């Protein structure tokens, strides 16, 4: 296991066709999970499952620039379940990040931060047991 929060370096940033895989288990009474693809202090891509926002489950995505959150992108399709093993795959494409959970496509997020080769860290936080975090080129 990996301690959470966890920082995965992404040496030399990200590039199209880079696939980042996060494996773990959702805690039984989970409230929130977050992935933060960072360019220094900026968050190029924040991926944030919320298990109980107003008695809904929702996926919130956003970007943080100079410590300011931008416009949220929200999804009600919610593939996570408390207590279960999960896989999140984030595939970097030329114009977006593409996210699949448990081998099912979830969402796309267009690039707001354009210096892909400076997005050099992935933070992983929240209500998970983290098993692995890695990357490969497809």
Ligand X SMILES: CO[C@@H]1[C@@H](n2cc(-c3cc(F)c(F)c(F)c3)nn2)[C@@H](O)[C@@H](CO)O[C@@H]1Cc1cn(C(C)(C)C)nn1
**Known binding-site residue numbers for a beta-D-galactoside:** 69-75
The three state secondary structure string of 89-100 is EEEECCCEEEEE
Using the minimum distance from each CB to ligand X, give the nearer residue, 22 or 34.
34
Residue number closest to ligand X, CB atom: 126
Chain residues that interact with ligand X, rule: CB under 6 A: 32-34, 46, 48, 60, 62, 69, 72, 125-126
Task: Mark the binding-site residues, compressed into ranges.
Answer: 69-75
Q: DSSP label at 79?
A: -
Residues 95/79, Cβ–Cβ less than 8 Å:
no
Using the minimum distance from each CB to ligand X, give the nearer residue, 89 or 125.
125
Smallest distance, ligand X to C-beta of residue 52, A: 12
Smallest distance, ligand X to C-beta of residue 106, A: 16
Smallest distance, ligand X to C-beta of residue 43, A: 9
Using the minimum distance from each CB to ligand X, give the nearer residue, 53 or 118.
53
Separation between Cα atoms, residue 13 and residue 121, nearest integer Å: 8
| Angle at CA of residue 69, ends 68 and 75, nearest 5° | 175
| Angle at CA of residue 136, ends 133 and 138, nearest 5° | 140
Smallest distance, ligand X to C-beta of residue 32, A: 3
Using the minimum distance from each CB to ligand X, give the nearer residue, 18 or 32.
32
Cα 10 to its chain centre, rounded Å, is 14
């Amino acid at each position: 296991p990996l301690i959470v929060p966890y920082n995965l370096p992404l040496p030399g940033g990200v590039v199209p066709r880079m696939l980042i895989t996060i494996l773990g288990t959702v805690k039984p009474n989970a409230n929130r999970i977050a992935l933060d693809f960072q360019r220094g202090n900026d968050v190029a891509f924040h991926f944030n499952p919320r298990f109980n926002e107003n008695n809904r489950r929702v996926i919130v995505c956003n970007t943080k620039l100079d410590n300011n959150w931008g416009r949220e992108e929200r999804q009600s399709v919610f593939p996570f379940e408390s207590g279960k093993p999960f896989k999140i795959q984030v595939l970097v494409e030329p114009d977006h990040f593409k996210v699949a959970v448990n081998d099912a496509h979830l969402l796309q997020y267009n690039h707001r931060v354009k210096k892909l080769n400076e997005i050099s860290k992935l933070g992983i936080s929240g209500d998970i047991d983290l098993t692995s975090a890695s990357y490969t080129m497809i």
